[PDB]
Amino acid sequence: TILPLNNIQGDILVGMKKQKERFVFFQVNDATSFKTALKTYVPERITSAAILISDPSQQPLAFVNLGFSNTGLQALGITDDLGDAQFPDGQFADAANLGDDLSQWVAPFTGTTIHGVFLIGSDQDDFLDQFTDDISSTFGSSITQVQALSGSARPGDQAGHEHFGFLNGISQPSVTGWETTVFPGQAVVPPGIILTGRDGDTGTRPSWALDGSFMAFRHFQQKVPEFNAYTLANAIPANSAGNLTQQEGAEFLGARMFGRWKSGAPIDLAPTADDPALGADPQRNNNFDYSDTLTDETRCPFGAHVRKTNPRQDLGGPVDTFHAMRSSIPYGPETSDAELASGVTAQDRGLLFVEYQSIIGNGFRFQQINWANNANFPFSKPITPGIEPIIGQTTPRTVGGLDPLNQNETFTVPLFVIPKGGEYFFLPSISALTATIAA
Ligand code: HEM
Ligand SMILES: [C-]#N
């Protein structure tokens, strides 16, 4: 098998990796007008995986991808069952299952008003505006923009880091069926873990759904001064190698909560001190599997973010089923000195989170519910791992093992990540956009 890279929406397989991204959420007002506008739009603007791997000079100023919710497909008379258990009812209907405080959800996410999303990746906010206006011009009254959420890479040496300060987008699965570089420690999975209708996908798909994917979108607000204050108060006093200053102990506690230092260095490889060169080295920063820390927490807590969401050898061996592609971007202004000093969030900032998989229940949802929210996961450990401190949602939010010299001590961690909404979308193949969606 050879994946048709020219027909796969690029953010799914390759990732836009643009400095700015905008999610333009819309409702369809008139199906006929929308469909003809869509046929005009697709060949000009929808960006394939092939374009994303092309020379930066062959590339457009902005990349655009497009997904639909269940109600969006219904509004367009696209009535064939896509085979996913969660997609049809939308994410709000699933939010309590995810552990969300529903009182924090806001319109237009609180229901099924959203019909789809244009994802625009570009280099400047002005360019996002140009391509948003282009959507408005092309689609006119056939749509209503119900929300737009815009993100940006953080400035300077924080580019690629999320708002708590940690380098993100390091670990991704590699799919077979195309010519790609595989890094040491990277999962190698069949393409149908990510792409509907391909080998590895067990869902019952219409033929036209080949080479699409499901997006789990989440809007997270982050409480950065609060996280900072917590790590400073609970700074680890020492580790195996020696004694830590308050700053060092706070950085270390954050690293223990995530499973990586802010630099990206995985604690399984760098358990006592940061190694920024390692964090920046794709040939080594994923070359670990917890095999040297399966039954103790000195090297890594059992419940660290990355360990919960990708358990590696905690599962007993490689498992292809539960991998997903991520394409998230931070949003909001930098955290001010006043905010940090006060320990209190004044401004809205966070993460626009995007995860792609063929089966929602096996990717995002499995990572969230079965793993992160489950105090008894990973299984068969000598002590209870607890709730994933970053995004685990079960109460009490107690996690063990954060102090490598006092592993039995538990930490009750305030929730620093607040879901404000989200949706489940299907991104069709590029051909399906015009041959099926717009038919
Ligand atoms: C604001 C919320 C979140 C923040 C700040 C955050 C941050 C991070 C960071 C810093 C990493 C390490 C970089 C890497 O290994 O690629 C990471 C990895 C990861 N996160 Fe998150 N994350 C968030 C939410 C989520 C959620 C909700 C899920 C899924 C339910 C998730 C799933 C993953 C996965 C699968 C990895 C890669 C794990 C691996 O392959 O080793 N994250 N995240
Ligand atoms: C995590 N992204």
Automatic annotation (TrEMBL):
UniProt keyword Signal present: yes
The DyP dimeric alpha+beta barrel domain, residue ranges: 7-155
One of the record's GO molecular function terms: peroxidase activity
Cellular component terms per the entry's GO annotation: cytosol
Domain of life: Eukaryota
Keywords of this entry: Heme, Iron, Metal-binding, Oxidoreductase, Peroxidase, Signal
Cofactors demanded by this protein: heme b
Residue span, Dyp-type peroxidase C-terminal domain: 203-371
Glycosylated residues, chain numbering: N243
Residues reported in the UniProt entry to bind heme b: G169, I170, S171, R260, H305, N310, R312, R326
One of the Pfam families matching this protein, by short name: DyP_N
Family: Belongs to the DyP-type peroxidase family.
Protein name in the entry: DyP
Biological classification of the source: Eukaryota, Fungi, Dikarya, Basidiomycota, Agaricomycotina
